[PDB]
Design a binder for this molecule. Sequence first.
Ligand SMILES: CC1(C)Nc2nc(N)[nH]c(=O)c2N=C1C(=O)NCCN1CCC(SC[C@H]2O[C@@H](n3cnc4c(N)ncnc43)[C@H](O)[C@@H]2O)CC1
Length: 154
Amino acid sequence: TVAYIAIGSNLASPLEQVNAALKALGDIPESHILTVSSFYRTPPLGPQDQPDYLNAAVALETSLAPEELLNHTQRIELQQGRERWGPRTLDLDIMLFGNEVINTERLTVPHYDMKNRGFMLWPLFEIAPELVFPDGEMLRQILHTRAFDKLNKW
Ligand SMILES: CC1(C)Nc2nc(N)[nH]c(=O)c2N=C1C(=O)NCCN1CCC(SC[C@H]2O[C@@H](n3cnc4c(N)ncnc43)[C@H](O)[C@@H]2O)CC1
């Protein structure tokens, strides 16, 4: 199954942190990275004084069950990270999990708010321009409809 994961960090210098998380995702059991988006520099969603964020998307091939993958992402955030409107040492959000629709106490997929977040959508559109959501919405359509500003690379 292909899962798409969003990564964000707003350490003043987040590259080492993001590469650590990326290595950790690749080391997840029964899983491997297919593709990584470019690294993007985004203005803080939240108070405007804190450091710019680095966002990216990852396509992860996995044989894990959805809640198992989440167990790993929470673990990586704990091991590599350390709140509300930022700063964020390290977030890993499961955006999509194959074509699965999940609505449980722990996990909502597609991610509940990505349709509103250009820092999530644009990196994803870089690696999966043809992506169709489980309900038939098109990633391309969402970006066309909303006209989110394009992002500068890191
Ligand atoms: C400060 C803020 C708003 N501003 C930003 N500005 C820019 N420019 N860029 C950013 O990047 C950026 N980020 C920001 C941010 O603050 N993101 C956290 C989102 N994010 C929520 C889920 C969990 S943190 C809460 C809870 O959500 C649960 N969850 C439910 N569904 C899911 C799911 N699909 N994927 C993952 N977690 C799930 C999870 O169990 C956890 O307990 C992990 C992280």
